[model samples]
Target: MEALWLWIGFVGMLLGTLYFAFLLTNAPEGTRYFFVITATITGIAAIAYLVMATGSGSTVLPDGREFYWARYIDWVITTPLLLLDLCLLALADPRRNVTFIASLIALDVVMILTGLWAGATVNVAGRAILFIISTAAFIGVLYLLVSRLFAEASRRTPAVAQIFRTLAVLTIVLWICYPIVWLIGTEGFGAVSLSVEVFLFMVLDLLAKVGFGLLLLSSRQALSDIGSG
Candidate 1:
């Protein structure tokens, strides 16, 4: 299982890198740059996860400041973009605004930095606060999405909305499985086996990846134009 997870994490990182390359060709020039930056961050995270999964030597604490920066990059860059991808689905009208786009970009930076601060510092209490804030941001977006879907049921089309909505729910459920397995296997709060938890996590991670890939491939036209259902 240990070796299995090591392979999974490594393969996931590699596939993610290739997927980023695909995005480079498919994405617009402006969007390409932002995703390029995100790709780098995700690349680092992939490597870090692989390291953790495989039980590489402990990450040497290069001074507190550097460690903090590492923590920041992990939280800010990784999960937030994943979450925002979901948010964009909610606002997928053709009349997308540049202001809204810019705001999203700016918020990405701010939230990431704040998340890094929360992760890198040596305060469990502070980390909890950061988690609360992060969770709230996600929940707020989720609420907006659900509210809009129900409120504008008349506007919702059948096929596209159904597919993406199912995708959303499946992805979120798969995502939750990783953390739940990790927490439960670790007994909620204790030293944990890197392989066991990561293997469990990778199961969900890979499923989500495949699901997103198929979803995007099928909806490539609509997604490219950011078209509504």
Candidate 2:
């Protein structure tokens, strides 16, 4: 089942990103850069997933703990681009945009690294603490998305605001599931099996990453057309 979920995720990310790449041809020039960057990053991560899924799976530590380091590597690259997609949509002020983007990327990296550590640690109390810290960082991300980034969106015209909110809200809602999934899955508190964990993560990635990218690219093209008229 774990194997199945991994392959599903691999194939989904790969093909899904290719579809996003296709959307780029029609995307506005202003918006095309981030789309291309994210598609490339996602494709790389998909390859990493495929390698992990098709290979011997996660590495077991000397202390007898198992960990999938590839996913962390993927997140370190792809998660930042995911945040950048939203940042590019909402922010036009170069300094403010760069600040928020950097913060989000830093937080995302910390969140994933701490999560990986928690999963690998054998100490229950320590693991719980790490989970708490990770969740806190994620909440920080949510706050930034809805409050700061969304506020920026609200300043735009009604049509643009609606599109921004659609993507922002969708991302927020799906992202909230990530911590919960981690808490209940093999990585965090281990309330569920590895198969279920992988499945949930895979589905969420499909929707949040691929689906969100498509909507944004399509919306951006529409906005570009409207502006041109």
Q: Poorest 10 consecutive residues of model 2 by lDDT?
A: 220-229
What are the candidates' C-alpha RMSDs?
A: 6.0, 2.4
Query: 128 in model 2: Cα distance from truth in Å?
Result: 1.2
Clashes of each: 2, 0
Global lDDT of model 1: 0.51
Clashing pairs in 1: 72-116, 76-112
Error of 1 at 185 (Å): 7.0
Q: Would you list the C-alpha lDDT of every candidate in the order shown? A: 0.51, 0.76
Determine which window of 10 residues in candidate 1 has minimal summed lDDT.
62-71
Candidate 1 residue-wise lDDT, 42-155, digit = tens? 476667656655556234333332121332344455555554554454444425544554454455555455545454545667766765565455454455445554343224
